[PDB]
Design a protein around this nucleic acid. Structure first.
Lengths: 64, 61, 64
DNA sequence: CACAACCCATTAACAC
DNA sequence: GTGTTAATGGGTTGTG
């Protein structure tokens, strides 16, 4: 089943992206982030992985 | 990363006789579990290998 | 595994979209489109349903 | 040229 | 219809 991000999960992710400058997190970091985001709903390490890749693609379309 | 010979035979086994192209993450680590016997190993290597091996079969087609 | 369109299947779909002006095909038309594309590879009626919606959205957003 | 490695664009599928 | 998650793929760099 698809992952649907909660408002809290999105803001924590955007926090790490914009204030901590996380772009391609190591698998160790992926486990740390998934661990924190699991408080708000079911989520896997691939979800945060795909989110960072998708968000970088989202950013590069804004600069266009 | 440098693959040992026995890892290549297991990968080519799974790819050519078991018809794995894009293994699911459970399968990725299940392959990794059997490959941990032969040397250094991570889950991303099997991901990268199957992605690269498909590109080669298909570039030559 | 998700459906990946073959080169000739995209050729036929984009033909139907741009030369036959098909946007939201009736379920009968899906069956007929499914018939021809299956003569070229593994597809389902759900694929042609998703594709015409997704290509219309992609063309919509591309205009924006 | 082969090899792993890892981006970058594209998009099918499904959530709403 | 809309938005985005989950992947598929092409191209590129590194190394030999």
């Amino acid at each position: 089943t698809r992952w649907t991000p909660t408002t809290e999960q999105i803001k924590i992710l955007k926090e790490l992206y914009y204030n901590n400058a996380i772009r391609s997190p190591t698998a160790d970091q992926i486990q740390k982030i998934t661990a924190r985001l699991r408080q708000f709903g079911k989520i896997e390490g691939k979800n945060v992985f795909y989110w960072f890749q998708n968000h970088k693609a989202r950013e590069r379309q804004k600069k266009r």
